[PDB]
Write an enzyme that holds these catalytic residues in place. Structure first.
Site, short mmCIF file in Angstrom:
data_model
loop_
_atom_site.label_atom_id
_atom_site.label_comp_id
_atom_site.label_asym_id
_atom_site.label_seq_id
_atom_site.Cartn_x
_atom_site.Cartn_y
_atom_site.Cartn_z
N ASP A 82 0.71 -1.39 -0.04
CA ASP A 82 0.01 0.10 0.06
C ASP A 82 0.76 1.41 -0.01
O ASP A 82 1.25 1.96 1.13
CB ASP A 82 -0.77 -0.03 1.13
CG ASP A 82 -1.92 0.99 1.35
OD1 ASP A 82 -1.88 2.10 0.62
OD2 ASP A 82 -2.90 0.72 2.22
N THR A 83 1.15 1.71 -1.25
CA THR A 83 1.92 3.04 -1.23
C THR A 83 1.31 4.15 -0.83
O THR A 83 2.05 5.20 -0.23
CB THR A 83 2.40 3.23 -2.60
OG1 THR A 83 1.31 3.42 -3.78
CG2 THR A 83 3.26 2.06 -3.17
N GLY A 84 0.15 4.29 -0.49
CA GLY A 84 -0.72 5.50 0.11
C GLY A 84 -0.66 5.30 1.52
O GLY A 84 -1.30 6.18 2.25
#
Ligand SMILES: CC(C)CN(C[C@@H](O)[C@H](Cc1ccccc1)NC(=O)O[C@H]1CO[C@H]2OCC[C@H]21)S(=O)(=O)c1ccc(N)cc1
Lengths: 99, 99
Positions: free
Chosen positions: A25-27
């Site tokens: 999850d890059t966010g």
């Protein structure tokens, strides 16, 4: 690996000798797992997401293996909808976005 | 481009006469933007994450430009704290995770 995004980037991870599925999850700044037992001292913390704030248990310096890549860092435990690997650990395994 | 994850992967996007910062977010199924007034038909929807659910409006076939790369698809609009480019559009611009 190179992971495309037509499907959720769910990967098997090893944490405390147990296998779990987690979302890359890059966010997410932080790594959060659903309720589970981890050993050692934890600190109460609060974090915010899209829908509001939640209370979590913060565990420091936890080893985690993500698709065979080792990381050691902060893992939160609390009411997340799915286990998420956030940037604190994605950086340790050398993960980048590319297009 | 290659985007590292030391900091939030925020990039410039265009959606109409608005240039905005948005997060390239592999943990988001669908793109969601901060409150704005887009044109066509829409469908009410609820999306959930850490902290619970928010109510949004789902718009289809909205063109956006992400770092010079054209995309066109579903954009949700609601009271998100951060503009998010989700997998629905990350795939269209050829974005992958690599480690
Ligand atoms: C929790 C995920 C499964 C889903 N979320 C995307 C996720 O990347 C958000 C994206 C995000 C980013 C900032 C603020 C709100 C939401 N990050 C997030 O909650 O991370 C939390 C853990 O680390 C902290 O750092 C950021 C917030 C904390 S989400 O924002 O709830 C979401 C859900 C559905 C859609 N369509 C779009 C977004």
């Amino acid at each position: 690996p190179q992971i495309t995004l037509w499907k959720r980037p769910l990967v098997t991870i090893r944490i405390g000798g147990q296998l779990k599925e987690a979302l890359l999850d890059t966010g997410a700044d932080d790594t959060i797992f659903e309720e589970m037992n981890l050993p050692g001292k934890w600190k109460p913390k609060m974090i915010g997401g899209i829908g509001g704030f939640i209370k979590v248990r913060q565990y420091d310096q936890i080893p985690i293996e993500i698709c065979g890549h080792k990381a050691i860092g902060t893992v939160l435990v609390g009411p997340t909808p799915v286990n998420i690997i956030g940037r604190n650990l994605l950086t340790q395994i050398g993960c980048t976005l590319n297009f």
